[PDB]
Symmetry: C3
Subunit: 469 residues, 3 copies
């Protein structure tokens, strides 16, 4: 702590008693000069003395200064002080809500000027931002409709500020906001993602990411408001601060059913995801793969469209060479594709074509047990495709079984039989028993109690030689 | 891919249509010149264009060129082309078997000359090598007896080639080859391990390694053919390419009962194993320890013979300082010896003499849970030997318990009580409870809910001092 | 082995037969000169030839030389030889006890001079030190009362030697010594911790550490003998060789109930523990934290006294930056304090004040599963305190929940849900479900089989901004 900070706190403690007496004067100017000093110390860019101001007893006074009858200069200074107390911890925000401030903020939305409207909508964002409890209380005193009508303003800083506040009102999942109040905001936010103000864009996107993070009826309401096509367009915005909330909202939509998913596909989301796989920022690449995995969990057509978009090769590259955070998402995408791909085998053949098999087995050795199971399940589907393809063509061999051995991947599957987790073990066993059965036959007589080993590892190499000369 | 490869494939696509027309001519020379070009492109040392030749439709023609009535020059060129298609993938090998080639190969064994015999036996090795399915089909068309009678040849390249083919016919475990057909080969292979041709030796050994990798009746049939004594002699062959299949076959024999095991012991296998423990190649050392562990799982006499051969000290060295792959085999050998060694304690006393106790405990901390259990089981037997020795002599202490503490090994046992696996935990507990019970008594009062610790680690050092002066 | 060692063993084997004949002579001088040589070779500072002397058959002779009728010079030389044989292994000690030596040692305590008393009490320490079996046998031949009466000596080397022997008689836990015999020693040891001889101090402390390592009745007997106040004083002895057995004995006392614990608190042990937290030797710091954890497992007053002693900050430092051995003890101390601290929340508030929350979560990722559970349990109590504090004050938020998220600690708790151990998993789950429930709500629709992720990790940062200008 700087010398200025220490000497500031020395000053304030010595000069707070007069400030408290000055804000209590009958002279309206005294009230105002005192309220300005309280606002200035609370506007301190670093370490506002919020708690010192609270225990001085003046928060009820400042809330009264927001009254109907009070001069606008005073309502604004007091609301700005109260805004900053409310930006602090939850306990500091409670002194403001318990003194009655929230209904007076809401009043200022009607009667204040553009500057008063800005301040009161900002304070309400700090209150709503604090907790689900305060967010709902703000909604419970009917803030929504006066907030919406502020968007027929054209002051940019006012719309910028109410957009941020709007996002705190939609934000939260346990519990969620009341849907019949926050849904009213969707026609406004649908227009706000066409703003040219970047900060307005950002908060509009976040607010839509929160509203779409809900059940089917929430996702449908977002599709009905014709929001998805512009969200997909913003996936190509040049700033990641827009990319991120937009990607998140699109990801939420594809947690829906196949109708929800097909909407974002028809507006071109697969092309956007492709180019987000090369984002310089790792959480974008991670979020993109997660999104894609929600799509490859859909229809064979929607799998086919993922393939048509040339998303298979980039997904393999990441699964091979990306940080574990992303590898685990790339594996979910390929494993979901493997699953639904059973009904159109050619999807699995193209995937095996592109070399998915070795990166799948490579990750069995470094993955947590959830990803091991998704990974085993992908290889199992690949083996399943191989076996029905084998019977169809009369083959003597499962060609995918052969590809999984030739990539080193079978001992890795075999070795996941040594897993504490019974699910893993039972799954790994059934893959070996079904497509690599020779690996479970002991090396000699099996009735003398001698060693049981997988027909010992130093097996002969190659079994077919061509005649070169 | 080289410029030559690309320009080759450009050439072939442009000049394949005439080759196809030339092989279909009525003029026998045309047939032959065309068949020679198909053979030459398929004899390409790298990347034979097998699939291009298959989809050209000529495999039925080449199979017909192997007919009874056809000139030998043509049967040979066609069989050599078909040999090389059959050396490819399983799907490429199917085009050859589904066109009828295998019974005509077998025919060529009777009617062909020495060069035709060579080619057809080679093609049959590629077919048999492909899969159990094709191996059995080859056996199912009665190839075995015409193949055997080729060994009254004395062309070295013919015997070399049929020996390799023979090994593919015996090879495979799920399912195994028909035993009443492949057993017919054992009198021949018994003579073939006395060949001076190294490549014939190698394949003879591999074939015997496959036939002996079977139930008791297979192992007995190998002993009856007087094969074991020469297999043990080849353990000292100067090349590891002979050492390896021979060691594997001997290892298979000692998965039998005590009678099977005693045969290889009487022919001097313990001396051979000793000198294979110092093999410069790590898979030999690993296979040797595994072999020995099958022996130390036998009689007290067979344990006694392992000790008599001075195999204990080298097994301890490896268990101490070898790669985990080998350490785990050395531990199985010592742990099996510990188990049967109970009936003649002096075996366990000599083993403890040589310092087996510390390397056993050292590995408890780095082993998978299968090796931990074998390792705990060895130490348990060592403690069991100590306790019956203790009662016999009137001792106040289990001297082996004392040796296991003095080597740091008891806290390692104690700490395996923190094992996810109940078997481990339950086993480790019973060792501590039975031979280190003080380790389970809490440090003070046990009824006040205070801390429970193993009479805290900073115990006093030494408890008996000698009077020096 | 030196040239001297080899040439010594060459000499002894050649010259042992006459020594054996010389010790059997009728001439008393011959007996004595022979007994002196046997004593000198057995007093060898390194590698006494104990076993060679045993198998020579002379141990019965040397035991007879301790008889009533024998000259004192001879009893002393023979007892000193027998002392050194008894300092060896348990099997070597048995030859001495089975020849009758122990009752003659005890006799020499009555009839010998000060030098004979020294020797026989030393030999008895070697016998008692060997095993519980021999320790009890020594007690069973009524050694205790003649040993105690040696402490009215004032020869320092005699008291030094009998103090060490006394500690071997009390030492041992499975089984323990007979309590109605070793308790007789407590009035003597209470005086012996006021000795100025450091070596007497050390063994007195160890002996008391063994006697106090017993049930409640043992701990009470130590408190009744007014031993605790001097043990706490010796915690500030300048040598760690006194610190260690004294700390151990004090630790044993606080495994008692609250009355036992309050005794060491009233004699100032908290100040001593504080300064032992900075001991340069790591086992002292470890033992000190363990001790403290037995105290923080007591009353709210005894927790309050730990806090009053300013032991909280040093315990956090270690939990943060000490070796895992000590971190695990510091965590037990803070977690016990957290538990009983529920009945006086201000203890938990001061602890959270000092920054215990981040070091607690930091260790969830590197701890074995016992320490993870103690650690989770501490955080759970901290969250429990937060929640009853929350309801009391009307807060919208659990401030401790907020502190645990802001320290990175919630994903660590969340991630311990991926634990093989059901206890861990079930505990970690209930913390998340109860105080971080939003973390278990999936990111979108939950009925379409899409991905289930914790409302994806790339959540927005901050949610309340202050108006700076």
């Amino acid at each position: 702590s700087s010398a200025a900070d220490q000497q500031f706190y020395g000053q304030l403690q010595q000069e707070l008693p007069q400030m408290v007496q000055q804000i209590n004067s009958s002279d309206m100017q005294e009230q105002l000069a005192a309220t300005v000093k309280f606002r200035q110390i609370l506007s301190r860019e670093h370490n506002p003395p919020i708690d010192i101001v609270i225990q001085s007893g003046v928060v009820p006074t400042l809330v009264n200064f927001m009254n109907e009858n009070q001069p606008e200069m005073l309502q604004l200074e007091a609301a700005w002080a109260l805004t900053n107390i409310a930006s602090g911890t939850s306990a500091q925000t409670q002194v403001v809500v318990d003194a009655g401030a929230v209904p007076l903020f809401i009043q200022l939305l009607y009667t204040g000027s553009v500057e008063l409207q800005e301040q009161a909508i900002w304070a309400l964002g700090n209150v709503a931002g604090d907790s689900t409890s305060y967010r709902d209380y703000v909604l419970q005193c009917s803030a929504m409709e006066p907030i919406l009508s502020l968007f027929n303003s054209e002051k940019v800083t006012l719309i910028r500020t109410a957009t941020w506040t709007l996002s705190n009102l939609c934000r939260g999942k346990k519990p969620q906001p009341d849907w019949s109040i926050v849904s009213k905001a969707l026609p406004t936010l649908a227009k706000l993602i066409y703003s040219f103000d970047n900060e307005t864009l950002i908060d509009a996107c976040w607010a839509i990411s929160y509203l779409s993070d809900g059940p089917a009826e929430a996702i449908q309401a977002v599709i009905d408001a014709r929001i998805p096509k512009r969200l997909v367009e913003l996936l190509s915005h040049q700033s990641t601060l827009v990319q991120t909330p937009a990607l998140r909202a699109v990801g939420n939509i594809v947690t829906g059913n196949d109708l929800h998913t097909q909407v974002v596909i028809n507006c071109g989301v697969l092309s956007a995801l492709r180019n987000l796989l090369s984002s310089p920022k790792e959480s974008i690449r991670k979020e993109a793969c997660w999104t894609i995995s929600n799509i490859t969990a859909g229809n064979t057509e929607q799998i086919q469209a993922v393939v048509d978009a040339n998303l298979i090769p980039p997904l393999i590259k990441l699964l091979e060479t990306a940080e574990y955070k992303i590898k685990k998402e790339a594996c979910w995408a390929i494993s979901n594709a493997s699953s639904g791909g059973l009904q159109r085998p050619e999807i699995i053949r193209y995937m095996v074509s592109q070399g998915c098999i070795k990166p799948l087995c490579d990750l069995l050795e470094i993955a947590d047990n959830r990803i091991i199971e998704v990974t085993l399940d992908a290889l199992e589907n690949i083996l399943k495709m191989g076996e029905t393809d084998k019977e169809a063509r009369g083959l003597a061999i499962n060609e995918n079984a052969d590809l999984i051995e030739k990539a080193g991947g079978m001992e890795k599957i075999f070795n996941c039989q040594q897993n504490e987790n019974d699910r893993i073990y039972e799954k790994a066993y059934k893959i070996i028993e079904t497509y690599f059965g020779e690996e479970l036959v002991p090396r000699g007589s099996e009735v003398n109690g001698k060693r049981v080993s997988k027909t010992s590892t130093g097996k002969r190499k190659f079994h077919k030689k061509s005649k070169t000369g």
